């Protein structure tokens, strides 16, 4: 028996020595040395320092450049706001509580901080899905005589909020729960504990399927069709060197987008799966911290891939950073 448990938490450490305390009450320095709490804080520092400028700049630059506010960019903006939720509701809170060595906001602070942290990265996730669907629709022309416009772009945005609430909202109400995780400085969905009172198991399956497999399948199909449609067009177009270039950059970009999505949700998936089928086994605080390291840094690398590497956005950004000229 691997940890000690309480009404609102599970500490990944044995109380056989009597040292374990509520993560809502006193420091966890038995889970990990204090310098490791500092490092965690240092990491949270990095993600704010990078995550905020680059995500905020995105909103700002949209405000400054008229050519940027277009229906196809709506979801990219949504990604930026999602990342910001991750930055404030999650990264900073964690910076703060890490410096105490425990979650100082208590069980209700846990629910809130957990809800927003989850809402943020889930909006971001479904944003990546919706974007792909749209790009599939617009470039692959699967529907006849259909033109994508303002009213579709709204729904796409709205659809990511309904999906994200469909994930984040249930633990507030008794389907799973929010509890401190890892080093217990931050709160997340309990996918690792078989807490039957909240039905944690049926939720982790529903998470695994609806919020992971569906996204993975849609994103592969949509971008798959695209790298098809564009490779087809170039082969029928070879007299055009530009169409040749295009098919080459779109493919590279789809490889980056697809690998990036995996690097973000695969650890959380691989770990959730392994724990589910490994149930007698003991999982340490730092190990539970790993798939979280991965999913959180997306708040930086996502807008670099999806914003800074987007030609139009990057130009307006260089204009704005460069004091209006260039």
């Amino acid at each position: 028996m691997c940890g000690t448990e309480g009404p609102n938490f599970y500490v990944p450490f044995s109380n056989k020595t009597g040292v374990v305390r509520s993560p809502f009450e006193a420091p966890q320095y038995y889970l990990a040395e204090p310098w490791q709490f500092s490092m965690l804080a240092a990491y949270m520092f990095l993600l704010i320092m990078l995550g905020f400028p680059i995500n905020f700049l995105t909103l700002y630059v949209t405000v400054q450049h008229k050519k940027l506010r277009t229906p196809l960019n709506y979801i990219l903006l949504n990604l930026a706001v999602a990342d910001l939720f991750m930055v404030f509701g999650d990264f900073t809170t964690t910076l703060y509580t890490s410096l105490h060595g425990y979650f100082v906001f208590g069980p209700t602070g846990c629910n809130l901080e957990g809800f927003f942290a989850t809402l943020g990265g889930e909006i971001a996730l479904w944003s990546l899905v919706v974007l792909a669907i749209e790009r599939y629709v617009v470039v692959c022309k699967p529907m006849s005589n259909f033109r994508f416009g303002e009213n579709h772009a709204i729904m796409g945005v709205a659809f990511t909020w309904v999906m994200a609430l469909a994930c984040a909202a249930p633990p507030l109400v008794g389907w799973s729960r929010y509890i401190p995780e890892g080093m217990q400085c931050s709160c997340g969905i309990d996918y690792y504990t078989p807490h039957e009172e909240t039905n944690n198991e049926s939720f982790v399956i529903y998470m695994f399927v609806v919020h992971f497999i569906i996204p993975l399948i849609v994103i592969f199909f949509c971008y798959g069709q695209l790298v098809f449609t564009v490779k087809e067009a170039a082969a029928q177009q070879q007299e055009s060197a530009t169409t040749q270039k295009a098919e080459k950059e779109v493919t590279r970009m789809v490889i980056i987008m697809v690998i990036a999505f995996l690097i973000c949700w695969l650890p959380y998936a691989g770990v959730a799966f392994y724990i589910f089928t490994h149930q007698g086994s003991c999982f340490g605080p730092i190990f539970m911290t790993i798939p979280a390291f991965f999913a959180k840094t997306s708040a930086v690398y996502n807008p670099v891939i999806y914003i800074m590497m987007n030609k139009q956005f990057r130009n307006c950004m260089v204009t704005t950073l460069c004091c209006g000229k260039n």
Binding site: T70, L72, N73, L76, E134, R135, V138, V139, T229, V230, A233, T242, T243, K245, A246, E249, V250, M253, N310, K311, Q312, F313
Partner: peptide, 11 residues
């Protein structure tokens, strides 16, 4: 397609 590729920020 290049026109729609441009719209999507892909090229």
């Amino acid at each position: 397609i290049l026109e729609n590729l441009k719209d999507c920020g892909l090229f």
